[PDB]
Amino acid sequence: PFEDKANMPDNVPDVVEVGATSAPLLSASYFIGAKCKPYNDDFMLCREESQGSGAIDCLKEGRRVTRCAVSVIEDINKSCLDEFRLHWQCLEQNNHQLSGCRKAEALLNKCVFTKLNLEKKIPGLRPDEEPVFLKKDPWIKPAVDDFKSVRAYAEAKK
Amino acid sequence: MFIGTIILVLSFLGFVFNRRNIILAFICLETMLLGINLILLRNSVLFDDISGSLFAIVIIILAGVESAIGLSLLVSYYRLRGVINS
Amino acid sequence: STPLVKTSVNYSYGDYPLIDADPHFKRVVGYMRPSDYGVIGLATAALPAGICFAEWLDPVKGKFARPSVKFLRVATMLGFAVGFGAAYARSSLRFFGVTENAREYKKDEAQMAARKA
Amino acid sequence: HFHPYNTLGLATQSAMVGLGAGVVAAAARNSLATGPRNILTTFSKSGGVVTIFTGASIAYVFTYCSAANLRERKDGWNHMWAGAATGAVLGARTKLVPAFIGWTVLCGAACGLFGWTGARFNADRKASLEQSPKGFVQED
Amino acid sequence: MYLTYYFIEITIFLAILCTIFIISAKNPMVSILYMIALFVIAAMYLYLIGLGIFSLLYIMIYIGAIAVLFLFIITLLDINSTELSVKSNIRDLPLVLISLIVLTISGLMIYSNDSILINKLLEAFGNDYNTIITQDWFNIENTTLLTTIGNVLLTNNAFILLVLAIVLLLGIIGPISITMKHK
Amino acid sequence: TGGRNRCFSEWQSFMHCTAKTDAKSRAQCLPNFEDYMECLHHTKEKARLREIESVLKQK
Amino acid sequence: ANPGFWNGPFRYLRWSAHNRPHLFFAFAIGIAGPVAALTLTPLRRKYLYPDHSPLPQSYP
Amino acid sequence: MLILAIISLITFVSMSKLSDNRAIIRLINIYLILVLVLDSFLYLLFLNNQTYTVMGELLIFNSFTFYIDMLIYFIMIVISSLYGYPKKELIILFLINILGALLIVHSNDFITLFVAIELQSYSIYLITAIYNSSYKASKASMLYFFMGGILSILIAYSINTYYSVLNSYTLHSLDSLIINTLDLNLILIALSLGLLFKIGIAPLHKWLISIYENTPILITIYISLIPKISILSYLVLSNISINSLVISILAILTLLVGSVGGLLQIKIKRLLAFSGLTNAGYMMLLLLLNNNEFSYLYYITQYSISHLAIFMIIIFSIYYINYINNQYNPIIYVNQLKGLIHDNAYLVLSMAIVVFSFIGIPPLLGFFGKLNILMSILNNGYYFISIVLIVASLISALYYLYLLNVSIQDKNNILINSNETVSSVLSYILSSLIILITFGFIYNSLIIDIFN
């Protein structure tokens, strides 16, 4: 019986965080990556060096690394709102098969690198990357019926 | 670990007080090897990932060969396949 | 190379036959061990007749015969194989000292020259 | 030094140990034959092995603590003079020849002479007493 | 808390109820019919405890192979059965089995942790009383794996796999050279 | 032969005690060892909980 | 009819694959496995490195 | 290089015309050459007996275990010569039994140990009933199987409790844990008594003995010696319990009395079965030690050579009986071989020196087996167990000398007219000559194992 414990309090010695939202942040996953990466690295480094001594990076890094992600999602909710919105709307269908929305990817990435000038640096030099135009692969099945007109118009207008 | 010790002990003293049917003794000795895994698996679950459960998949793969040699040896508890005898 | 950052430990000298992986170590490696050999490379040849010496071991298997018939080929294979292991048992060492130690003359130079791995 | 023992305190606990041994073992010996029957007649077969166990403690350790009250200070020489009384219950095992019961008494005494404590320890290099320390060599 | 779904774990009563059948059967093979019920109750236990994988392994390989082989033998060369646990065959049963059940209960007590007393004998029987374990949340588990880690350990401990290759080799060569009887 | 354990976190602070040879100091690892043991079985945890529920029982 | 006979191996593999061929064509696959697995170390000619990862904890 | 030999000659027994008396010559000479060209690991063996570990779970202790596998190879060469020169297709599983035994003499950790003891036990279950046209072997094999199954789950239950108290498995991780939680001690004595199925410690006593008399003599030489050395060599390689803490000493007390109180036996096989049981009980006494293995390593060879020798001598004594027993088992009564000294009395001399071996008259064996045993005992301080070992030696000597006193009384009517049966004679002569000339090189080994 996996019963749930749901106790409540609030602890004094630090300023509270701001949490984050649902599985649509999987679309924004690289978008926090290149910007908030050294914050991430210093957080996990300070966690690993204090051997067993957790709960002491909360006030420094447990606040800081969440501040950066909150800033990134606020920037993306003003910058490319519906471009984010239709993209995760695609991406909540198709099991989060992240291959399954790779045409609205290019719309969202072009919008981000336009306005918030980030990238998606998947580390590793050997193959090609995010523009593949698959050509022997497992592209999609239901090709995002509300979004094919979007990338079609982006090919049309732009 | 009640769940594995109880089935182990009952298989064991079933193997003691077995004044009937050689094969019930033989399968009680078999069920010892699954009375022991209910100990082993829940100790591994209470601990961790694969440390004791590797020994569990070992004892399953080997308990197969146990029953195989036990059958193929019980066939020769007599003469072979069948002849006149007494 | 050739694999991940996983490691395969094996310091093998026993009666269960093993070998070595691609590379990451300080002990004896896979392909260098067959090389850096000596004039003891016919030690495997010395066993190559020894299991073929079973004909000399035939002191009347049956009554009044000799020259066991052409399964010696099989014996010849084992006469190779054990001796091959005996040649592969000639791990002098990989860059230790206090032994015969031709490795500091015929394999120190290879670790000098191959300065890119 | 030593402490004299509670003779009753060892005695009743030892008698319960002997009776429990007579239950768990001297009634376990019912596999030996084809006279079958389970509970009421097990002790018909096995009245002569119970109190061979239970009488053994009442013979032995009662004598042992009484010897510790007589020749005190907890020496091994109690045991040889203890277990002879155990032979008396062995004498009750065979009331055939009193010369043989004196025989089994003295042989049980000589048996009891040695079994003081098997697997002795804390004797890292054993069996070398050392004299008074003047940079000693011929011990360890 | 869904009252029965908390005592759905205590299925050990069905285990002891099946095993009390397993040594006192009528026919010689209604017992080994009940043995597969014992194994599937063990599978229900393992699915309930958090490892359904080995439940499905037991269903695949015990009642898939070895229990099938018990049924396979018990058709041919069927041994002469004593009929059941008669009272004359329940002779000298209670007089050692009661003491043996007590001594083995003390052995299960001897599986306890560290106390040099009889306190540990009572401690394991009250182990559920003062405790209900607290699960946690996912701190950096990248890839999904249940028995994949078993093969990872089977790669680290590769030598026992290559030796149980030899024990399966023996499991096939033995029944050849003990029953075929070459000409 | 030790997978990613829920008790791996007490190997190191037990093994770094036996990094130096203080297992022949014979007691320097005993806090580390019995903390490893409390990771294994949660004994004094469990006695602490039994104590506080006994105090709960008397209210 | 004739079985296989070892002493002429070019002949043996013929009058194995022609009279009891059903184990021949199995063991042709059994030799196409590892022998071709040894003729790859030039044939990949350093084709690719997979480059997967669990969590990359970095350095100072 | 045993696995390569196994996979070679299982392919060699396949597509064989069931001649099957030549393949053992190949296995004998192959093990001979393998020992002759694999003894070169003794130089890299020991500077200070530096262990070497395969992958964390297997251990190579170059003074101890590298001698144990050499003894295994030696007695295997002797058995393989004994089948040469009545057989079925079996040496494949002889070699894999060896593989299991050598794994348990190299097993650092319990997974390898359990796999290998069970592999070994399966080999014993199979070898017991290869001679399937018996009524002796049919009963004995199934009895050995069921009790090996009980003792197998006793092994595994001991180690499962060991895992239940500690999430590791290795005894390398026991590392003088001196807080010594008491269940660790009880688990370890349970594992000890589990591995001690083969010695047939006096509560586990009788069941092996009917099996030994119900196998053919060409088999009961092999399995009165292989697991006898194997499980104990594991048990001395790792010293589980420093002392007994009286558990094991009671087992050997009731053994070495209560198996030598088994004096009156008319069956030969029972007689030297009790011999090989009680002399195995001897080396259990220095399982009760710590940091002591020289006496054990010397006593294995300076017992097992002579055990092999007395079996080979009563093999040679079939020819002289003027009666035989069953097809599989020739000579089961002592009184079959009465007037043997009026037959070829040189083998009576060999039988004499190998039984005076077992009683331990000084200048050949007993002053070098039992002397090392007794110095290992009295190093620790087990004063009582010394004198009961002495009583065990005397009462063992009585039924030992039973064989020589029935060996050389007087013959009814037999002297001499025959053909010959030889070329395995150098094997028995080698074992007898190494038995009664070890007093020459009894000091070279004392230096060599001091340097290992």
Curated annotation (Swiss-Prot), chain B:
State its Enzyme Commission number(s): 7.1.1.2
* Major subcellular location class: mitochondrion
Topology in the membrane? Multi-pass membrane protein
Membrane spanning residue stretches: 21-41, 55-75
Catalytic activity as recorded in UniProt = a ubiquinone + NADH + 5 H(+)(in) = a ubiquinol + NAD(+) + 4 H(+)(out)
User: What is any one GO biological process for this UniProt entry?
Assistant: ATP synthesis coupled electron transport
Q: State what this protein does.
A: Core subunit of the mitochondrial membrane respiratory chain NADH dehydrogenase (Complex I) that is believed to belong to the minimal assembly required for catalysis. Complex I functions in the transfer of electrons from NADH to the respiratory chain. The immediate electron acceptor for the enzyme is believed to be ubiquinone.
Mind telling me what this protein is named? NADH-ubiquinone oxidoreductase chain 4L
Natural source organism: Yarrowia lipolytica (strain CLIB 122 / E 150)
The gene that this protein is the product of is ND4L
Swiss-Prot record, chain E:
Per UniProt, what is the membrane topology? Multi-pass membrane protein
Would the keyword Membrane be found if you checked this record's keyword annotation?
A: yes
Q: Which GO terms describe its molecular function?
A: NADH dehydrogenase (ubiquinone) activity
For this protein, the parts annotated as crossing the membrane are: 3-23, 32-52, 53-73, 93-113, 158-178
**Keywords for this protein:** Electron transport, Membrane, Mitochondrion, NAD, Respiratory chain, Translocase, Transmembrane, Transmembrane helix, Transport, Ubiquinone
Gene Ontology cellular component list: mitochondrial membrane
Tell me where it resides: Mitochondrion membrane
Matches recorded under Pfam families: Oxidored_q3
Task: Tell me the superkingdom of the source.
Answer: Eukaryota
Which catalysed reactions does the entry list for this protein?
Answer: a ubiquinone + NADH + 5 H(+)(in) = a ubiquinol + NAD(+) + 4 H(+)(out)
Q: What is its main location?
A: mitochondrion
Cross-referenced Gene3D superfamilies, in alphabetical order?
A: NADH-ubiquinone/plastoquinone oxidoreductase chain 6, subunit NuoJ
According to the UniProt record, what class of enzyme is this? translocase
From the UniProt annotation, give the residues forming the signal peptide: none
As for what it does, the entry says: Core subunit of the mitochondrial membrane respiratory chain NADH dehydrogenase (Complex I) that is believed to belong to the minimal assembly required for catalysis. Complex I functions in the transfer of electrons from NADH to the respiratory chain. The immediate electron acceptor for the enzyme is believed to be ubiquinone.
Q: Which family does it belong to?
A: Belongs to the complex I subunit 6 family.
Assembly, per entry: Complex I is composed of 37 different subunits.
The name under which this protein is listed is: NADH-ubiquinone oxidoreductase chain 6
Gene name of the record: ND6
UniProtKB/Swiss-Prot annotation, chain H:
This enzyme's EC code(s): 7.1.1.2
* Gene assigned in the entry: ND2
Pfam families hit by this protein: Proton_antipo_M
Classify the protein's membrane topology as the record does: Multi-pass membrane protein
Please describe what this protein does: Core subunit of the mitochondrial membrane respiratory chain NADH dehydrogenase (Complex I) that is believed to belong to the minimal assembly required for catalysis. Complex I functions in the transfer of electrons from NADH to the respiratory chain. The immediate electron acceptor for the enzyme is believed to be ubiquinone.
Name the record gives this protein: NADH-ubiquinone oxidoreductase chain 2
UniProt keyword terms in alphabetical order: Electron transport, Membrane, Mitochondrion, Mitochondrion inner membrane, NAD, Respiratory chain, Translocase, Transmembrane, Transmembrane helix, Transport, Ubiquinone
Query: Where is this gene product found?
Result: Mitochondrion inner membrane
Q: Which GO terms describe its cellular component?
A: mitochondrial inner membrane
